[PDB]
Amino acid sequence: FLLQEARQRLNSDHRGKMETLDIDRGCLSLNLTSPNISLKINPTRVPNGSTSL
Amino acid sequence: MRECISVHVGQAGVQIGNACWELYCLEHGIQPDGQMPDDSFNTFFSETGAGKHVPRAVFVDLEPTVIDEVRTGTYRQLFHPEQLITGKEDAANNYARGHYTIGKELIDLVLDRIRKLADQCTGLQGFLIFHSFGGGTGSGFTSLLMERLSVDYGKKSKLEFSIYPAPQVSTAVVEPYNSILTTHTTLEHSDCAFMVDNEAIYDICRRNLDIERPTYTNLNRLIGQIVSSITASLRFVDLTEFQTNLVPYPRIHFPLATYAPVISAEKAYHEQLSVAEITNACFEPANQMVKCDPRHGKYMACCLLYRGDRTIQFVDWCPTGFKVGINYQPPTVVPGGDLAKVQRAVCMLSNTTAIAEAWARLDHKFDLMYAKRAFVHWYVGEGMEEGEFSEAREDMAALEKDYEEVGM
Amino acid sequence: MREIVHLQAGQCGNQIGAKFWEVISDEHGIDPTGTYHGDSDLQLERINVYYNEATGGKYVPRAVLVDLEPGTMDSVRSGPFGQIFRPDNFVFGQSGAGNNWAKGHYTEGAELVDSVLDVVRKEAESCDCLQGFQLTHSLGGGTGSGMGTLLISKIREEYPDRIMNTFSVVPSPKVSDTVVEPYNATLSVHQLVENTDETYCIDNEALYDICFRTLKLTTPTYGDLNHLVSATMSGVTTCLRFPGQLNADLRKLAVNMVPFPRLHFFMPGFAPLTSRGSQQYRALTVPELTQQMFDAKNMMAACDPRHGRYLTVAAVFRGRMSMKEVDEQMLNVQNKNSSYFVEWIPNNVKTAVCDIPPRGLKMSATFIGNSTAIQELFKRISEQFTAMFRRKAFLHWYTGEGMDEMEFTEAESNMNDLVSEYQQYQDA
Amino acid sequence: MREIVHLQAGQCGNQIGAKFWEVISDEHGIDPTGTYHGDSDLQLERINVYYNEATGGKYVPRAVLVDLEPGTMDSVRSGPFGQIFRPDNFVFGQSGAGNNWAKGHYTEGAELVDSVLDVVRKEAESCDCLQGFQLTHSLGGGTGSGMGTLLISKIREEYPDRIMNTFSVVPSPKVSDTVVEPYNATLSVHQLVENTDETYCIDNEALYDICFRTLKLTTPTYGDLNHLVSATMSGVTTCLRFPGQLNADLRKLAVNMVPFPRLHFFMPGFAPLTSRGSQQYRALTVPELTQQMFDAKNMMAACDPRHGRYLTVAAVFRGRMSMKEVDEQMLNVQNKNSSYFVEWIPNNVKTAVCDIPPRGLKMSATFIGNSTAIQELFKRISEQFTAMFRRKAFLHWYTGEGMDEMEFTEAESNMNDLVSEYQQYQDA
Amino acid sequence: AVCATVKEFNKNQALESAEKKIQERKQEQEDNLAEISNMLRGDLLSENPQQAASSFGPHRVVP
Ligand SMILES: Nc1nc2c(ncn2[C@@H]2O[C@H](COP(=O)(O)OP(=O)(O)OP(=O)(O)O)[C@@H](O)[C@H]2O)c(=O)[nH]1
Ligand SMILES: Nc1nc2c(ncn2[C@@H]2O[C@H](COP(=O)(O)OP(=O)(O)O)[C@@H](O)[C@H]2O)c(=O)[nH]1
Ligand SMILES: Nc1nc2c(ncn2[C@@H]2O[C@H](COP(=O)(O)OP(=O)(O)O)[C@@H](O)[C@H]2O)c(=O)[nH]1
Ligand SMILES: [Mg+2]
Known part of the structure; x- marks a missing residue:
């Protein structure tokens, strides 16, 4: 039972790391001629759920 | 050539001087290592030929465990290793231990390092003594220090920044005995003692700034701002004209303190901070730094230190009562500090008649204890006779009648 | 550099000390061998207050373990932490006191004080500036009370300007297990008034009361009552080892609660004592520490402070907390109660704040109250x-x-x- | 800023006030374990009226449960929401009152009264500004009424400026499940006269008339009666927790309806009580809330105000609604009737509007009236x-x-x- | 202009002070969880009998 619970938490952690790897690779993939550059509503703000490094 | 030797006695002195010297390091270019990455630091720093800048301060305690944190903290490399003086056993809230038994083991060492610091300075203005009335070392060794400095360093200015005891809260039982037995022996040996107590600064940090539950560091930083505004005209009036323009009679050297904009960065956006606004806010009783009220007394003198860009009733014999000084450098924000960034500030130092209630309460509580002779055996057994209680009480009786006599 | 020598006598003083040293060694990261296994630098900084460095990184306590029978020196030596004590410090005789005060004071214990005073003169010379002594003993026995108050009278003639605490286990009228209890307790309170500087009074019917109605333990042994005492015993020495914003020596506490030289019998208390069912209900703040500290369900002595004035009060906080909230709760408990506090003392409560909490807690506190209900x-x-x-x-x-x-x-x-x-x- | 310390006494007092907390906690979005799971911020901004904070974002009520036998303090704990209470606030004796008013006033409940005034002072001196207490009890039992008047008789003297509301269940005229009822209730109404700011009167017979004739249930129960009490308890104290266009505290109703200090017995009611089948026809407007507060069948006391005169009238409206249309109906009933209103008060009705409605309803309404037919x-x-x-x-x-x-x-x-x-x- | 950049600095400082307050509150909740988890795991409240085990052997116990 305890091994099952630990595997559950490690699977969730792997899921989170893959999705932010996707987001970071897209952010690097943008350049000076992408058509999705759109001067957004509020940069430099920090959301409510924000941990530190 | 416009130096100020600072002396920090007691835990209050050391923990205030930490904030003061962080601000003094950051106002100029000085890193906490001691190197700059212009000579206006010369009032507070010394330039070794090895590039290092060493402060003109002496930190004294009878206990080692508040100076060991300075020795192992971030500012470890800045201080000269023997400008920080420690004993072995503290004074233990005892004026007698702090004056007669323990402080005599350190008074000669402190005077030796003070002489070594004063030989470097060409033109020395005067000394600044930071202490607290309630403690053992800050009430005994401080008074012993002023007694042994008066005969040694001439008619120099001896300014004091004291934590006077708060009207209803304190962290000791035996505090009024110290708070009277130190005033009786520093009455003739001092020039000007600005008194701030912790309760009014708690009120201001709760009310003006929005810091509910502050600690001592949020108080030490505001004290550092006041000391910088006092000494800023040496770097960017003097210390010498304060004792002329604030102390008429030679026993009434007890002025007050105020810093005019103490506001947060989420309310500095909402308002002007013009000269009229900050001048009006100096004279407001909610913004004083002693829990008292100058409406119920009479003003005697005021010094207004501007920095950057029929309710008030005076005495019969002082009609003017105003000294004004202007400086051009705006105050400097520290990271992690709680005040905003502002262009103007005022510091007012005012001598008033409305401090008579503080001495009346102190005498009342001393009488309340001493009429039944509580706690006297500690003070008698440590090399101090009993009659000094009687002389200190009749002397402070004379002081209260002095505060009434000048008002009449 | 303010060292403390521990002295401990009897079965009661040797089974308290086996649990007190089990608490300090956790606080400084010492395993049962004696090697520092810790994760800070504050723990190693002032370990010399209680520990003597040996060769090889070992640390041994500065304790002297005395007794009059050899039976309690073996259960101490066979505990979990029994192999850190220096083997010369065990001073044990071979004929018991037999619940008798006079054999402890005149016949058996008098042939043993000269073999204990040799030992304590060896740990009084390893200290660069000795602060003071400590004794843990029981007033209801024969070698805690005869030899124990014979040592204090012989220590105080040789080190007369130091500090001599005691942690007395005064007998209780209800939890009592000796017929000849009040002969030894009367002839020892006579011996504590003129030879100690502080004396914390502990009754065993008040430690059972806490372990039954607050901690809600099923079967409290003596090992769970020695943990209650040993949490206060390290709460009064906690500013000598860890830094703070407002420190307190043991001397500074002697100054503020002894107004007259014969009034030094206190009543200890410890603030965050809670159950295991009420752990998710407790909110973990400073007003909750102050409400439980002053509770009359909570004192470690069997006398109620609602029957008399409070002469003076202490508080020794631990943790990272706010000096406004610490200072506004002592004023708050003092103005509603007009006649629970003596009139000629206008401020009665002395506060100190250390900065390092106990191992596994966020904050804590301690109470040392001097009452005329004692x-x-x-x-x-x-x-x-x-x-x-x-x-x-x-x-x-x-x-x-x-x-x-x-x-x-x-x-x-x-x-x-x-x-x-x-x-x-x-x-x- | 305005706290209420809940008290509750007896088997009647706990079976009423365990359903009241399930009502309030789902009025504020609190799960059975205590944490917050809601979709507003008006659910959370005024939650300190009733809930002490705990750790980890968990809220515990300000309720103290007193009783004189431990059997009814385990049906409360084993209900749905029984795990939200702090376990110390459960107070129970070991021997019952025995439906004996003397036994709970003089003998059994005079040693339990000293053990609950420790609990009620730890919860009263932890508020920023205490508004006033409550009570829920019955004047037929022994521990609800004997000890339950000893509490009010005592904590009026210690706290004489605060508010002391009570929710009595005075004995029923027709149904009577105790022969020794009238000695209980006669000896208890004298203690209500001097020591109480407001007192409501609830008859369990007139709760049975609602739940059969109007709500039209096949099987009523003592949860369908404890839902009617708690839906009136929440209506008096909802302008303390939720903003309005016009506010009404607990004081502002006692200021207006209590002219002379001996006359504080009221008559509750509640407007939108409709059946499943008749819901398609009912539930229309604001004239269908003033129609059913003032209907003489809906009173929660078994005494009819047609026999006498309304000294003062009150009404607390819930729902976001028109400040005109509320005020036009109270003008409409004050003018059609003449001899149901006292002559020397020409504005006998006080009104209040609260925005956030009850749970599952879009609008609602609540009544208090004061009669010389009480x-x-x-x-x-x-x-x-x-x-x-x-x-x-x-x-x-x-x-x-x-x-x-x-x-x-x-x-x-x-x-x-x-x-x-x-x-x-x-x-x- | 100088008033504009001072007001902008004040607004930015208000944002960082608010975020520092949020961070220290969350760290306080973390220390509360560590408090209660260590106190439940503690042997004093668990009453595990293994604390009676003695270094002399598994047959004798600590009295
Ligand atoms: N404003 C301010 N006051 C402080 C600070 N530290 C200590 N105090 C004051 O110090 C007083 C207590 O006496 P201490 O100065 O700490 O003790 P001491 O002077 O070292 O005397 P001993 O303890 O006997 O060595 C309290 O009343 C505090 O008001 C501080 O950092 N800031
Ligand atoms: N609180 C506490 N009391 C103890 C402990 N061990 C023994 N006692 C009490 O100490 C008393 C006996 O004292 P004892 O040490 O036997 O005195 P001695 O005969 O002179 O050694 C009894 O009342 C025991 O209840 C202990 O570990 N903790
Ligand atoms: N409304 C209501 N009334 C009750 C309940 N239980 C008992 N009663 C009434 O309360 C009276 C009995 O009081 P009770 O609480 O049982 O006595 P106590 O336990 O000694 O306080 C009787 O008149 C019952 O009809 C209940 O759950 N709800
Ligand atoms: Mg000190």
């Missing part, structure tokens, strides 16, 4: 001493050791006057 | 007290507990004047 503790003893001695119930054990009947008369009026001394400030 | 309640208790007391029936079950016979004779003449007090505001 004089009912010396009258239940003085109503049972005089019930027996008016007919000389058990005296032939005591007289036949070189002891006279007149010592049972001078130790009556010398405790009948301390009750009247605490009485004269009960009402002005 | 003095037909005491002329029926005193017809069955002096029926029994004339021939001295059950007297040994009260006199042998430490009373005397002239404590009875004063307590009837402390009710036969409040009857003749209300009879002189009957005709000017």
Whole structure:
């Protein structure tokens, strides 16, 4: 039972790391001629759920 | 050539001087290592030929465990290793231990390092003594220090920044005995003692700034701002004209303190901070730094230190009562500090008649204890006779009648 | 550089000390061998207050373990932490005191004080500036009370300007397990008034009361009552080892709660004591520490502070907290209660704040209160001493050791006057 | 800023006030374990009226449960929401009151009254500004009414400026499940006169008329009666927790309806009570809320206000609604009726509008009225007290507990004047 | 202009002070969880009998 619970938490952690790897690779993939550059509503703000490094 | 030797006695002195010297390091270019990455630091720093800048301060305690944190903290490399003086056993809230038994083991060492610091300075203005009335070392060794400095360093200015005891809260039982037995022996040996107590600064940090539950560091930083505004005209009036323009009679050297904009960065956006606004806010009783009220007394003198860009009733014999000084450098924000960034500030130092209630309460509580002779055996057994209680009480009786006599 | 020598006598003082040292060694990261296994630098910084460095990185305590029988020196040596004690420090005799005060004070213990004073003169010379001593002993026994108050009288003639705390386990009238209890308790309170600087009074019926109604333990052993005492014993020495915003020596606490030289019997308390069912309900703040510290369900002595004025009060906080909230709760508990506090002392509560909490807690506190409700503790003893001695119930054990009947008369009026001394400030 | 310390006494007092907390916690979005899971911020901004904070974002109520036998303090803990309470606030004795008013006032409940005034002061001195307490009890039992008046008689003296509301369940006129009822209720209404700011009167018979004739349930129960009490408890104290267009505290209703200090017995009610089948036809507007507060069948007391006069009237409206249309209907009922309103008060109705509605409803309404037809309640208790007391029936079950016979004779003449007090505001 | 950049600095400082307050509150909740988890795991409240085991052997116990 305890091994099952630990595997559950490690699977969730792997899921989170893959999705932010996707987001970071897209952010690097943008350049000076992408058509999705759109001067957004509020940069430099920090959301409510924000941990530190 | 416009130096100020600072002396920090007691835990209050050391923990205030930490904030003061962080601000003094950051106002100029000085890193906490001691190197700059212009000579206006010369009032507070010394330039070794090895590039290092060493402060003109002496930190004294009878206990080692508040100076060991300075020795192992971030500012470890800045201080000269023997400008920080420690004993072995503290004074233990005892004026007698702090004056007669323990402080005599350190008074000669402190005077030796003070002489070594004063030989470097060409033109020395005067000394600044930071202490607290309630403690053992800050009430005994401080008074012993002023007694042994008066005969040694001439008619120099001896300014004091004291934590006077708060009207209803304190962290000791035996505090009024110290708070009277130190005033009786520093009455003739001092020039000007600005008194701030912790309760009014708690009120201001709760009310003006929005810091509910502050600690001592949020108080030490505001004290550092006041000391910088006092000494800023040496770097960017003097210390010498304060004792002329604030102390008429030679026993009434007890002025007050105020810093005019103490506001947060989420309310500095909402308002002007013009000269009229900050001048009006100096004279407001909610913004004083002693829990008292100058409406119920009479003003005697005021010094207004501007920095950057029929309710008030005076005495019969002082009609003017105003000294004004202007400086051009705006105050400097520290990271992690709680005040905003502002262009103007005022510091007012005012001598008033409305401090008579503080001495009346102190005498009342001393009488309340001493009429039944509580706690006297500690003070008698440590090399101090009993009659000094009687002389200190009749002397402070004379002081209260002095505060009434000048008002009449 | 303010070292503390631990002295511990009897079965009670050796089983408290086996748990106190089990608490300090966790606090400084010492395993049962003696090697530092920790995860800070504050723990190693002032370990010399209690520990002596050996060769190889070992640390041994500065404790002396005395007894009059060899039976309690083996269960101490066979505990979990029994192999850190230096083997010369065990001083044990081979004939017991036998629940007798006179054998502990005149016959058996008098041939052993000269073999203990040699030991304590060896740990008083390893200290660069010795702060003071400590004794843990039981007033209801024969070698905690005879030899224990024989050592204090011989220590205080050789180190007369130091600090001499005690942690007395005063007998209780309800939890009592000796017929001849009030003879030893009367003849030892006479020996503590003129030879100690502080004396914390502990009754075993108040430690059972806490372990039954607050911690809700099923079967509290003595090992769970020695953990309650040892949490206060390290709460009064916690600013000598860890830094803070407002420190307190042991000397600084002697100054503020001893107004007159014979009034030094206190009542300890420890603030965050809670169950295991009420752990997710507790909110973990400073007003919750102050409400439980002053609770009369919580004192470690069996006398209620609602029956008398509070002369003076202490508080020794631990953790990272706010000096406004610490100072506004001592004022708050003092203005509603007009006649629970003495009138000629206007501020009664002294506060100190250390900065490092106990291992596994966020914050903590401690209470050392000096009351005129402590004089009912010396009258239940003085109503049972005089019930027996008016007919000389058990005296032939005591007289036949070189002891006279007149010592049972001078130790009556010398405790009948301390009750009247605490009485004269009960009402002005 | 305005706290309320809940008290509750007895088996009636706990089975009412365990369903009231399930009502409030789903009015604020609190799960059965105590944490917050809601979709507003008006659910959370005024939650400190009733809930102490705990750790980890968990909220515990300000309730103290007193009782005199441990059997009804385990059905409360084993309900749905029984795990939200702090376990210390559960107070229970070991031997019952036995439906004996003397046994809970003098003998059994005089040692439990000292053990609960430690609990009620830890919860009263932890508030920023205490508004006022509550009580929920029954005047037929022994621990609800005997000890339950000893509490109010004591904590009026210690806290005489605060508010002391009570929610009585006074004995029913028709159904009576206790022979020794009238000695309980007669000796208790004297203690309500002097020591209480407001008192509501709830008859369990008039709760049965609602749940059968109007709500139209096949099986009512003591959860369908404890839902009616709690839906009136929430209506009086909802302008403390939720913003409005016009506010009404607990004081602002007592200021207006209590002219003279002896006259504080009220008559609750609740407007939108409709069946499943009749819901398609009902539930229309604001004239269908003033129609059913004031309907004389909906009163939660078994005394009809047609027999006398409304001294003062009150109404607390819930739902976001029109400040005109509320005020036009109270003008409409004050003018059509003449002899149902006292002559010397020309504006007898006070109104309040609260925005956030009850759970599952889009609008609602609540009533309090004050009548000189409440003095037909005491002329029926005193017809069955002096029926029994004339021939001295059950007297040994009260006199042998430490009373005397002239404590009875004063307590009837402390009710036969409040009857003749209300009879002189009957005709000017 | 100088008033504009001072007001902008004040607004930015208000944002960082608010975020510092949020961070220290969350760290306080973390320390509360560590508090209660260590106190439940503690042997004093668990009453595990293994604390009676003695270094002399598994047959004798600590009294
Ligand atoms: N404003 C301010 N006051 C402080 C600070 N530290 C200590 N105090 C004051 O110090 C007083 C207590 O006496 P201490 O100065 O700490 O003790 P001491 O002077 O070192 O005397 P001993 O303890 O006997 O060595 C309290 O009343 C505090 O008001 C501080 O950092 N800031
Ligand atoms: N609180 C506490 N009391 C103890 C402990 N061990 C023994 N006692 C009490 O100490 C008393 C006996 O004291 P004892 O040490 O036997 O005195 P001795 O015979 O002179 O050694 C009894 O009342 C025991 O209840 C302990 O670990 N903790
Ligand atoms: N409204 C209501 N009334 C009750 C309940 N239980 C009992 N009663 C009434 O309360 C009276 C009995 O009081 P009770 O609480 O049982 O006595 P106690 O436990 O000694 O306080 C009787 O008149 C019952 O009809 C209940 O759950 N709800
Ligand atoms: Mg100090």
